Amino acid sequence: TIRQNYNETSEAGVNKQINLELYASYTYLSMAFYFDNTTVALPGAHKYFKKASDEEREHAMLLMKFQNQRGGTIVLQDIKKPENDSWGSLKDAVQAALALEKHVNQSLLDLHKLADSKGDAQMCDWIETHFLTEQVEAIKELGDHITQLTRVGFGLGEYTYDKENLG
Amino acid sequence: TIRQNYNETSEAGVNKQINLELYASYTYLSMAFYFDNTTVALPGAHKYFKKASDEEREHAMLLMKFQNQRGGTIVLQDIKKPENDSWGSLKDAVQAALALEKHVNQSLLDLHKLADSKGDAQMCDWIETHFLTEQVEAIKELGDHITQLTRVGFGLGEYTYDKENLG
Amino acid sequence: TIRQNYNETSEAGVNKQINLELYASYTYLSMAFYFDNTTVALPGAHKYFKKASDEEREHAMLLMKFQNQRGGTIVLQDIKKPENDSWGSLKDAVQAALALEKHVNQSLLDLHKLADSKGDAQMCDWIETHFLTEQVEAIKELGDHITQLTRVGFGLGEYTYDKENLG
Amino acid sequence: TIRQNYNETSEAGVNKQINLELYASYTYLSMAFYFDNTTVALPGAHKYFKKASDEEREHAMLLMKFQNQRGGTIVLQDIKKPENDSWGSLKDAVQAALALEKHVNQSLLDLHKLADSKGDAQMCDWIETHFLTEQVEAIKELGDHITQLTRVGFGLGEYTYDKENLG
Amino acid sequence: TIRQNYNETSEAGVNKQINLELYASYTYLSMAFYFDNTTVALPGAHKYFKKASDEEREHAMLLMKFQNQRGGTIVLQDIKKPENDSWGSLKDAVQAALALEKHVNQSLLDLHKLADSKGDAQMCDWIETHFLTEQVEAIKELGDHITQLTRVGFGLGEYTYDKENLG
Amino acid sequence: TIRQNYNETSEAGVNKQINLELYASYTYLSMAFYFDNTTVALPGAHKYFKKASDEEREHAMLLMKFQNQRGGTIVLQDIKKPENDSWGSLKDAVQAALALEKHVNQSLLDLHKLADSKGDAQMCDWIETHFLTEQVEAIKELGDHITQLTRVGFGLGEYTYDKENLG
Amino acid sequence: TIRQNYNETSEAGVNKQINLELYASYTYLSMAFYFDNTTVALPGAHKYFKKASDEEREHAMLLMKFQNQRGGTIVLQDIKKPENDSWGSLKDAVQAALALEKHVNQSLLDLHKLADSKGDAQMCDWIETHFLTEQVEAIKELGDHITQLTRVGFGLGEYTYDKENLG
């Protein structure tokens, strides 16, 4: 019996967060191959979102590794399909991604407000060390990608930011 | 308009196969972290299934890349959760995996019997080149893993095949 | 006598395909040196289409190598001049190449449907291995090039996609 | 005078934790040289527990380094002898270490709950950074070791997990 | 149970094809050491056919690997002795090898025609990938050998082609 | 809009803390060039404080980066001149630096106490990771410098500690 | 307008020479793969004519590059098929080659005599630099090839000069 100072409501939030980080992985993967369809054809975005889809997958496994470390149990659920089939312009996908990370961001803090509420000190710093700080930077990198894609404008500017920056 | 000699029923089978190869990726990922829970604690199996979950993910992207190459359109659906939460013994997971690959195997041939039926010659050899031959070997490697795990027996034999072979 | 299971009508479709792949190599060479004339002045397209003219010449030699391998005999015909002397904008030349590849694609499939009808199993896999999949990638890349040249537009965009992508 | 926001009760819990980490380093050293006696003869456990005794001695020096850093003063007490002279089978020693780590874990958390109560923000993150997560991994690995030593059994299995894993 | 979509009649043709490729490794072996007899003394042909005898042995093992991979059961029969104890001149042996490869070629296509009739798609491409194309090249090279051995003539030319080309 | 869980009062404390770390980079700069004046002539202290002046400048940029990362808005005020034009002896400067670091230390904890009161979890660990622990080490090293500068005494010892330790 | 001192008859004489070299490259290609057919099977001649086929293609692109450098316009006509389908013996192909190079030679001197009548001083030296001297060396090499092939005679001699010289 290795479980020590691990509430069962903190355990259910880890399962909820795992399914969430997998949902992001499955939306980015839609974005990535949306930019691969011949009617879009933005290769840099295809690479950029394909790494991002692989990185949100990393999030879920980390939370699955943590769940096993503390003594809980991984309870998986369905990964719902993304909320669109086409993602519009390059700006429109990045705007969609920002609101996704902001959703995951709030869910992570609520998970941290829950751990601090059950006095789960190790879970708090495990949330700080791996997620809280990484999430702000991703939002900031996204928020800086939107402002740039607005600047360059449609067309040649939309292509140039795909090759040079995301590629 | 790049679409040439690509039936729309061959297109729906690619979508069905993509969701399938993602279902396998999400079952292996359950197996992988099932073997990571402290009540199981078989590290070699955790690595072995974590690569396998990453490899079935490769299957889906390949079929998503193909879908975009021929001119179709990727229509994603929910990835259903695996059919168990605990996977029993190391033999029991490998037996479960074999019946999974055999399920994907039959679905791939049916997809190839469909393409040959619509005279889709390039899709047939794209199924031959990447999936048909790779699927038999995985089944054979699994069928050879079961027979070995039956030989070594429970306990020390179950651990030894985890470290030496899968690890 | 090396000829075995090589129908005589399968042998005529090979010579037809040889004269076809030489017509494409000779069309791209017109495109390549059209983009070299001082009134066009797009070097990346000149390089891009000069390698493609060499590559379709590779297609024909492969088909001539095969004809001799199966015991047939090569029968050359005239290489008709291209359908145009000037090829318009950079988008217009890529749209003509796409229209040309899709014709060669249909004739290869027709040649493959001809091989399977005569039970020429070895000829079928030879067309699978060297052309059918290579030809789908050729169409997908072209259709992606057109999508981008449409995005960047005329003027600076036509020069931009000429230097960075095609060259 | 360097002492700032360092409560005097936070200072006593540090000395208590120092004497605690020295008691663990001295218990593992008993275990390490128990597994070196000719009647046990398990070298991989001897090496494994001799590095752990050095590592808990590292814990205490970290806590002594911290005490001096915050302006406190180190007050040493006696290092009580371990609760046993012999430690039974290989599984029995790993189960005692687990029972020992979980005690040290509770005292670290108690020490952390003591730091947060006195608004000692820097002491809280110092306990987060060096111990809390390192201590969850120590418990998870031990509980995984017990699961395996149970699987392999006695006799050959107790020797096997001693040579390949612990050594 | 790994067997899936592997007809029992397709399994018989593999056992048959194994005994055939073994018959070809034993004929080339006879040819390889006929040219080593002091009354013949063509070392280049002794090297050439010995590699051929080792390569048709490879064929039998590839088919035996496939038989095990598809879940079947390898059934061996007698390897009949070659049809000649002496093989005449260098042209006469290469002409004999050409008639041998063409017999194996017809039995492979009949095996492939048997695989295609039972809908065994994987077996078909497996025969395509490893045999149908390799066999036509082996025949084409033997027919060219016969054409070149007829050009140089008997005597000196029969020695020259042995040293320079076969060796 | 990237701002999330970033109270407006927490934003004011960052602007304040930026102006503070700028005040510390401008005081150490005064100290660094006081020790360069010919009537002082302590080069090791001129090197030591110049690195300190560059390092507190780093602090201000880290806080300005964080202000932009969290979506806030950097507001700059005057950087007030230091409290002295001459800094006395080497002990007197290190004693002055210790009182400076302790002022910054208290304002950081008050900033952290402000971040904790608004539930700003990310800001708290961001202050933990980059400041709270770095600040206690800076203070501990200054107090040890004062203790060592008191041991060696004025004159020769005041020169020895400058060359060997600070330089 | 870059055109300067470039007559319009010299321009039509460059377009005629382009179609001539292209007819020469398409004849050598017929010769090369004629020597690849199994009833001929002369590998050294296949390689030799494939380089000469590729070499005469280079003549055509040099002239097209020249046509573009002088301000003109490339006008392409049909490349007529070679005058034979089978080329006889290796002596017979080199004799036909020599006659073809002598024809291109006179057409180049006629084009140099056409440029010298229009006072086109740069077109003269451009023909001298790239063609006139290369062509005489090509004619001297073919006539040298014809004298040797007659020396070695038919049969074994025709093979040896194929392997050793043309290979």
Residue numbers in the entry:
A (entry chain H), B (entry chain H), C (entry chain J), D (entry chain J), E (entry chain C), F (entry chain C), ...: 3 to 169
What does the literature reporting this entry say, word for word?
Ferritin has prominent octahedral 4-3-2 symmetry, and each ferritin molecule contains 24 C3–C4 interfaces, 12 C2 interfaces, 8 C3 interfaces, and 6 C4 interfaces, which provide several potential pathways for metal ions and small organic molecules to diffuse into its inner cavity.
Additionally, in their SC crystals, the C4 rotation axes of adjacent P156HAfFer cages are not aligned perfectly, while the P156FAfFer molecules are perfectly aligned. We believe that such a difference in protein assembly between P156FAfFer and P156HAfFer is most likely derived from the stronger π–π interactions of Phe–Phe pairs as compared to their analogues. Thus, if only adjusting the pH and NaCl concentration in the solution, P156HAfFer forms two kinds of assemblies, while P156FAfFer only forms SC assemblies.
